[PDB]
Chain length 461, copies 4
C-alpha cells in the first residue's frame, strides 16, 4: 500500500479528496513538480509566483508537522519525474485532482494513459467545483439567468471530508530557493506587498470566518461603493485552492436560511447577491469547457498604465492597482472599457498587463470578464454606448473620497466638479489649487472625437 | 416516492442523515410523536420539558419556512399512529435515527419488525456518536475495561463518517394537535419556569452561535480555567448536546483543527488545552459504550430536605445547591463534591440523589448520570475509593483560592478572612466576633460532625 | 518667615487656601495632631478610621515628594503640642481652615485667643463651603426657614470665591510618632477590615480620577437612573467629600459648565439631570446652614439585633442591611426605607439607629446625618409626616420594577415571580410551593404584623 | 452701572477677566468691532478669517443663550464707534484685555487717553500670558535656558475666574454676513476644511481633556515622528484665546506631580517636554516686547509652493500643508531651511505664504521660528551647515510611511533608498515602478553646487 499524491493547485489539507483517499488507504509520498516548459504562454506572472512561494513554504511546514514532508522537483519532463519516483520508492498508486485548463486536460490524459500501460493504477477526483460541466443540460444553456435558475433548482451531489489525522512516512529533489520563482533584483520591491496581504490556508480560514460573521449583512449596500474595503477579498485565496468553495457556499446558505426565517429582507438581498457572485465562477468554467484597426501606439499604452490619462477614476484605479495588486469590480469594468473604447488599443496588451499585475490572475474569469465588457455576449453593455463620468461618479463615488485619497493634489475641488474638471470654470479652478497642464494633465483624447471614431466603426455594422 | 421522517431527539436540520436521505429521495412528511406511557420511569423532568417545548417551537418555525410543516401527535400507541399516517397519506418509506436507551432499542426493533411485515421498507441511521459501540475491540476480540486504553485505541483508529449539508427545500404532502395540548407544562408553574430565560435560550440557531464564539475566543485558556468553579469557565454545551441541536462530529472537527495549528507553531499551552477538551468529549463516547456492552442507609427525611435546600453548614455544598436551584446547572467539581457528601456523610439512599438531579438538572442524561455516579461511588477501579473523605480546607485552597464563589452565593459571609472562610468551626470566637458571622443565629452549625461520620463509614 | 500649617480635615493639596498662603509667604512646617479626649462622643467610628489612615499615608507620600514632610503627634492637649512646636522651630505664624462642628468652633476660638496672647499671629480661612452661613438672609435680615426659598436665593446671588493652584515646592524646616502608633485600628480587626479594598480606594489622586469619569460619561442619565436602587446609579462621592479630598467648588463648576452647554443646544434631559444634581449639591449647604443658625419606646434588644442582621422578613429592608454590612454604603431610598422602618414599625429609640449608622457608614457626617433623620422623623414640615406608612408593593413597583435588587442580595428567593416578590405573605401556597420558597424554614415570616403596628402608631 | 465689554481675541467665556469684572459689577453691553484699515499689513489671511467667522457664530449663540447678545460693527474709526455706543446707551465704564502686538499697544494707549479726557473710566486686564514681560529680570535675560530656569523658580501670581452665570441686558450694527470675511468664489473650496477641524470653545475644551487624559504619557516618544498625529494640536485654539493657557499649565503640572510621586521616569520626561514647549510661547512674547543677494526667481518659488522640488520630505510637507492647513514642527524646520539655504529665496515670500496658508498664523511665534532657523540667534543651527536627507529620514521617518502616504507614486521603493532616490541604481529604479523625469521630478538644483554657493556667502564672513 504505497501511494503518490500529486499537488498542483490545491494547497490545503481540509476537504482534499485525493489526500484523504490516499491517507485512509495506506502510506503516502506527497510531491510537487514544477515544469516551466510545458506551460507555454500560460506561464504565471510575478505577483502570482510571489504568492505561490509563500504558500508553498506554509504548506511544507504544515506537512512536516503532521509527519511526512513535501518534495519539490524542477524538471523538463513530468513523466520522467513520476517514473523516477516510482523506481525509487516502489509505489502502487497515483492520485490527483481535476483541472479544466486546456494544458491541464491534455497533460492529465497523457499521464493516465502512459501510466496505465505499465500496470500502475491511477485515480483523479474533483476538488474545485460545485457541479461538473457535463452534468447540467436542458442541450447546454446559453444565458446565465437560465443556467443559474437550473443550478439552484437541482440538488448538490457532494460531501465534505475531514482532514487526515497523521501520515505514515516513506531523484534530483531540491529546495524552495532553487525553483527560481523570484528574480534577483525584485526581491526587496516585492517584499512590500506583505503590508496588505498574508498568504496561507491558515489565514484564508481566519479571513472567511470574520467576513461571514460580521460583514455579509451589509453586502447589498456596500457592494456598489468603491472606497475603503467593501467586498470580501477572497479571490487570491480561491485561485490557489486554499479554501473550499463548497465550504463558502454552505456558510452563506445557512446564514440565508436563518435570515429568511426571521423576516429580514435586507439579509435576504445580501445573501442572494453573494451567492449569485459565487455562481458566476461556475458559469465561467462551464462556458470555457463547453465552448472552446487598432492604433499601434506605444506611448498611449504607457500613459494608460502609469495613470496620466486625465480621468480621475481611471487614474486612481491604476494608482491603486500598481501599489496593492487589486481593484474593485466597477473599476475593472471602467478601466477595461476605457482602454478599448477610448484609445482603441489591442485588447491583448490589456489582458497581458492584467495577467502580470493582478494578484489573482485566473484564465476563465479573465476571459469571461473581457468578453462581457467587449460586448461579445448579448448579456452586457454593447460596444456602441460610452458612459458619462459625472453619472458614473454620482452613482459609485458620491463624495469624492476615493478620488481625494489616491490623487491628493485634488483635495480641494468641490464635490460637484471633482469628476469632470474640464467643465468647471477658471474661477473655480483658481480658487482651488488645481492647475491643468502644470500639476494635473489635460484629457489625453477628447471624448467627443473618440465617440465619433467608434461611431464610424460601429455604424459600419 | 413518499417518505415519513420520524423525529425523536435530533432537533436540528444540519448533519441530519435521515432527513437528508428522505429529502434527496423525494417527498417528505415530518412527524413528532409523544407517548408518556411507553417511557416508564425514564419520563423526563420539568426542566427538560421546558427546554423541549421551546426547541419544538423553534424547529416548527424552521420547517415551515423551508416549505413543509411539523405534525405533533399525542397517543397511547406508536404503531397505531404510524399506521394511521400511512393509511392517510399513502407513503412508501419510513426513516429515523438511532438511540441507545433500553426503551429506545426495544421500540426500534418492534417498529422495524411490525412494519416489514406489511411490505413497507424501513431504514435507520447513526446521528449521535463517533464510533458505534460494536466497532471497537481488543486484539482478542474483547471489549476494553479502562478508559485510558479505550481512548488510546479510539485515537489510534480513523473515523468512518462524513458530514451532510442541510436540505435546500422540501416538497410538501389523524388526531394531530398543537404545541399547547401536548401537556408539557403544568398550570401553576408557568410563571416560575419563565424565569430561566434569564440565563439560557434554546434552539439550534443559538447552539451554533454559542459554539463558534467558544471555539474562537475561550478554548486557549481551558487548561487553566478548567479547575476554578467561579464565573463561567467551561463551555456550557451539555443541554444543547443532549437534544441533538449540535453535531458532536462538528465539535470534534473544530477542536482538532485548532489543535493542529497550535501544535505546528509550538504552543504548549494550546496543546494542553485542546487535549483536555477532546478527552472530555471522549468520555461521553465511553459512557455510551459501557452502557451498551454491560447492561444500611438512614431513612431520614429532614436530612434530605436540609441537603436539598442548602442548610448543611458546609460552604461549598451550600453554594452548589443554591446555584443549582436558581440556574439549573453546576460545575463538575461541585457535582463531585455534593454527590460524595450526600452518600459518604449523611448516608442517604443514592436513588434519592439520582432522582433530584433528574428533576432539576437542565441536561439530565441517563448514560452520563450513571457513569458519574458509579465513578464517585467507587464501583469503578479508576476513581476515588469510598474509604477516603476529603478535607474542606484543601478543597477550597485547590479550587476556590480567594473565596469569591463563597461570598457571591452566600453574602452573609462577606467579611470572613480568606484563611478561615471554608472551615468556620475552626476560627476562634475573637475572629467570629470581629466578623459579622454568628453560627446558630444567621448561619448553621455543621449538621453532622465530620469525625463521627468518618468513624461510621470506617465501620462499614 | 516661618509658618505652621495645621491639617484637620482637608487632606488635599489643590485648592487649599491655608497651605497656598503659607507656601507663598515663606517656609512651612505641616503638622497633624490627633487627640481622642477632646472629641467627646463625636469620636469617629471604625469604618472612618480605616479610611483616615489610608488617606494619611497617601498624603504623607505626596508631601515628601514635594520637599517637606508630615509630622504626626498624639497628645492629651493641643495647646501644649502647638507651643512645643513653636519652642522647637521658632516660627512666626499659624494658619488653618474652618470647621462648623460645635467642638471645632470652641477649639478654634480657644486656640486663637491663647495664641494671640503671646504675640504670635494666627489666621483661618474657608475651605469647605460655597457661602458662609452668616451671609444669606431675607429682606428683613432674617434667616430662611424652607429649603426652596433658601436655594432660590442662593441661586439668585453670585459666588464670591476664587480657586487657588497647588503649591509648586516647599522650603523645608517633641514626641513625634509614626502612622502605626496613632492606634487607629484594633488588633483583631485588621484582616477583616482589609476586605473593603475590594470596592473602595482612598486618596485625593483617586477622587480626581473618579470625578472626571463621572462628569464625562454618567451625568446625562442622572435624572433617570437616580430612582433605581440596583447596580451603581449615583455618583459615589460622599466619603471623598467628607474628608475634603475634593473641592466642592470644583464639583459645582464642572456641573454648571455642562448645564450651560446642554441648555444652549436644547437638551431637555440634560437640563433636568444637571438641575437635579445641583439641587443635591445644595442640600449639603443647607444642612450646614441650619446647624449653624439653629443649635414610649420598647427597650427590646433582640428586635434591634434582628434589625441589624437582616432577619425582619421584608425584602427591601433585608437587602439594604445585607449590602450595608458588606460594602459600607446604601442608596438614598434604602436609607429612607430602613430608617423609617426602624422608627415607625418596631418603635425603637432613634439613638441606637443613629449610632449604628455612625459606626458602619463609610462617610459618617454629623450635619447630613442629623438633617436626614429630622426629615424622615417628621420634625420638619417639608417631608413625610409620622402618621403615614408606605406600602411595600408600591415601593417596589416604583423603585425596583424587576426584582433584581432582591434576587441579587437574597438568592434564596431567585424563583418567585416578579408580581409577588415584594410582599410574599400575600402569594398563595400553590405559588409558594411551585417556587422553592418556604417561610419559617429558609426565610422568615414577618417579624411584626403591619396592621397592628399601624394601630399602635395610630394610638401615639 | 452700565459697562461696555470689548471683545478682540478672547472668544471664550471661562477665565475671561474683563467679562467677569463687568458682569459682577452690573449691566453689560458686549461688542465686537472690525476695522480693516487700522490693521495695516498685519491683516489676517484667508485660513484665519474662515476660523474667525465660525468662532464668532459659536460665541454669538453662546451669549444669546445666557441673556445678552453680541453686536458687530464694521467701521472706519474705532473711537467713533465707541463714542456712538456711549451716546446711544448711556454707559459709565469700558473694559477690555491686553494684547502685545505693536498696533494693539498703540491703539490701546490712544483709546485710554481719548476716553479719560471725557470723564469716562477705562480698565484693562491680562488674559493671554503667565508672566507679564516687565516682571522677570536678572537686566533682561538673553537665553531661553536661563529665562526658563528663572521662570520655573519663581511662583505664579494669578488666579482663575469662574464664568458669569447670567447677564442683565441693555448705530450701524450689522450681521455676520456683511462683515465681508469671506470672498464669493472661495466659499465651496474653503468649506472642505471642516473635514479635519471644528472651531469653537466648546470644542477646544473637549479636545484638551482627551489629550491630557490619554496621550500625554507618550509625548516624549511620539514627539519626534512626523507621521499620523503625535502632538497635541492646540495652536489654532490658543491663537484665538478659546482656551486658557493657565488652564493647560495647571493640568500638565498636576499630572507631573502624580507621576513624579510614583516614580515614573517616562512620565516625568513627557511632562517636562510639554511644559518646555508651553514656555517657548512666553519667551517669544517676552523677546518681542523687550527688543522691538537673493535670486528673484518666480518659477522656483512656484515649484517650491506646489511641491515639485524633487526632495520627498519637502514634497510631502507642502502637499499636506495645502490640504489641511497644518504641518509638524520638524517639517516646518525642514521646509523653511530648504527655502532659504537651497534656492536662495527672499525670506519675506516664505513668511507671507505661511501667513496666508497656516491655520494659526501668529506674529510672535512666526518671527521667533524664522529667526531660529535663519541663525540670527546663537542658540540654534548656524547658516553654514546643511543637513543630509538620509540622516533626516533615518531619524524622523524610519519606515517611509509619511512618504508613501502623501506621495503614492513611490509606494514600492525599498525603505533603504526612499529618501535619496538619485542614489539608487537604475536596476532598482527599474524593478520599482519609479521613473525620474516622467512621473517624478529629478532634483531641481544639485545639493553640492548650492552648498558651494552658500559657502561663498558664508566664507565671505
Ligand atoms: C475585466 C474583468 C477582469 C476580471 N478578472 C478577474 C480575474 O483575473 N480573477 C478573478 O477571480 N475575477 C476576475 N474578475 C471578476 C471580478 O472582478 C472579481 O472576481 C472580484 O473582484 C472578486 O473580488 P471579491 O472576492 O472581493 O468580490 P466578491 O463580491 O466578494 O466576490 C466573491 C467571489 O465571487 C466570485 N465572483 C464575483 N463576481 C464575479 C464575476 N463577475 N466573475 C467571476 N467571478 C466572480 C469570485 O470568485 C469572488 O471571489 C474580473 C472581472 C472583470 C470585469
Ligand atoms: C455526579 C455526576 C453527574 C453528572 N451528570 C451529568 C448529566 O446528567 N449530564 C451530562 O451531560 N453530564 C453529566 N456529568 C458530566 C459532567 O459533570 C458534565 O458533562 C459537564 O459539567 C459538562 O459541562 P460543560 O460542557 O460546561 O463542561 P465541558 O468541560 O465544556 O465539557 C465538554 C463536554 O464534554 C463532555 N464531558 C466532559 N466531562 C464529562 C464527564 N465526566 N462525563 C461525561 N461527559 C463529559 C460533555 O458532553 C460536555 O458537554 C455528570 C458528572 C458527575 C460527576
Ligand atoms: C437617614 C439619612 C442619613 C444620611 N446620612 C448621611 C451621612 O451620614 N452622610 C452623607 O454624606 N449623607 C447622608 N445622607 C444623605 C444622602 O443619603 C447621601 O448624601 C447620598 O447617598 C450621597 O450619595 P451619592 O453621592 O452617591 O449620591 P449623589 O446623588 O451623587 O449625591 C451627590 C452629593 O450631593 C449631596 N447630597 C445629595 N443628597 C443629599 C441629601 N439628601 N442630604 C445631604 N447631602 C445630599 C452629597 O454630598 C452627595 O455626595 C443621609 C440621608 C438620609 C435620608
Ligand atoms: N452576463 C454577465 N457576464 C459577465 N459578467 C457579468 C454578467 N452579468 C453581470 N456581470 C458582472 O456582475 C456585475 C453586476 O452588475 P449588474 O448587472 O448591474 O448587477 C456587472 O457589472 C459585471 O461585472
Ligand atoms: N475513569 C473515570 N470515570 C468517570 N469519570 C471520570 C474518570 N476519570 C475522570 N473523570 C472525571 O473527570 C475529572 C478529571 O479529574 P482528574 O482525574 O483530576 O483529571 C474527574 O474529576 C471526574 O469528574
Amino acid at each position: 500500500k504505497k501511494t503518490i499524491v500529486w499537488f498542483r493547485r490545491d494547497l490545503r489539507i481540509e476537504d482534499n479528496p485525493a489526500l484523504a483517499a490516499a491517507a485512509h488507504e495506506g502510506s503516502v509520498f506527497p510531491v510537487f513538480i514544477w515544469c516551466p516548459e510545458e506551460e507555454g504562454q500560460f506561464y504565471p506572472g510575478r505577483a502570482s509566483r510571489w504568492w505561490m512561494k509563500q504558500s508553498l513554504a506554509h504548506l511544507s511546514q504544515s506537512l512536516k508537522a503532521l509527519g511526512s514532508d513535501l518534495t519539490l522537483i524542477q524538471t523538463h519532463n513530468t513523466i520522467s519525474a513520476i517514473l523516477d519516483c516510482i523506481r525509487v520508492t516502489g509505489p502502487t498508486k497515483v492520485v490527483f485532482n481535476h483541472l479544466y485548463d486546456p494544458v491541464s486536460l491534455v497533460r492529465d490524459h497523457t499521464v493516465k494513459e502512459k501510466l496505465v500501460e505499465r500496470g500502475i493504477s491511477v485515480q483523479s477526483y474533483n476538488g474545485d467545483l460545485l457541479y461538473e460541466p457535463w452534468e447540467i443540460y436542458c442541450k447546454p444553456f446559453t444565458s446565465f439567468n437560465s443556467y443559474w435558475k437550473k443550478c439552484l433548482d437541482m440538488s448538490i451531489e457532494s460531501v465534505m471530508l475531514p482532514p487526515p489525522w497523521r501520515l505514515m512516512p516513506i531523484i534530483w529533489a531540491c529546495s524552495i530557493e532553487e525553483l527560481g520563482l523570484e528574480n534577483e533584483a525584485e526581491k526587496p520591491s516585492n517584499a512590500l506587498l506583505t503590508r496588505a496581504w498574508s498568504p496561507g490556508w491558515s489565514n484564508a480560514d481566519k479571513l472567511l470566518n470574520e467576513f461571514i460573521e460580521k460583514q455579509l449583512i451589509d453586502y447589498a449596500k456596500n457592494s456598489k461603493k468603491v472606497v475603503g474595503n467593501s467586498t470580501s477579498l477572497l479571490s487570491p485565496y480561491l485561485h490557489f485552492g486554499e479554501i473550499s468553495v463548497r465550504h463558502v457556499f454552505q456558510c452563506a446558505r445557512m446564514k440565508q436560511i436563518i435570515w429568511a426565517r426571521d423576516k429580514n429582507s435586507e439579509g435576504e438581498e445580501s445573501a442572494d447577491l453573494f451567492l449569485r457572485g459565487i455562481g458566476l465562477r461556475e458559469y465561467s468554467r462551464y462556458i470555457c469547457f463547453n465552448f472552446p484597426p487598432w492604433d499601434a501606439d506605444v506611448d498611449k499604452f504607457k500613459a494608460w498604465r502609469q495613470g496620466r490619462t486625465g480621468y480621475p477614476l481611471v487614474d486612481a484605479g491604476m494608482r491603486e492597482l500598481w501599489a496593492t495588486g487589486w481593484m474593485h469590480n466597477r473599476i475593472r469594468v471602467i478601466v477595461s472599457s476605457f482602454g478599448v473604447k477610448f484609445l482603441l488599443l489591442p485588447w491583448k496588451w490589456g489582458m497581458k498587463y492584467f495577467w502580470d499585475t493582478l494578484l489573482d490572475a485566473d484564465l476563465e474569469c479573465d476571459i469571461l470578464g473581457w468578453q462581457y465588457i467587449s460586448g461579445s455576449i448579448p448579456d452586457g453593455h454593447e460596444l456602441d454606448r460610452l458612459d458619462n463620468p459625472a453619472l458614473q461618479g454620482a452613482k459609485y463615488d458620491p463624495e469624492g473620497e476615493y478620488i481625494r485619497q489616491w490623487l491628493p493634489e485634488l483635495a480641494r475641488l468641490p464635490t460637484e466638479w471633482i469628476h469632470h474638471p474640464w467643465d468647471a470654470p477658471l474661477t473655480v479652478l483658481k480658487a482651488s489649487g488645481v492647475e491643468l497642464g502644470t500639476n494635473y494633465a489635460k484629457p489625453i483624447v477628447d471624448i467627443d472625437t473618440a465617440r465619433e471614431l467608434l461611431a464610424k466603426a460601429i455604424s459600419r455594422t
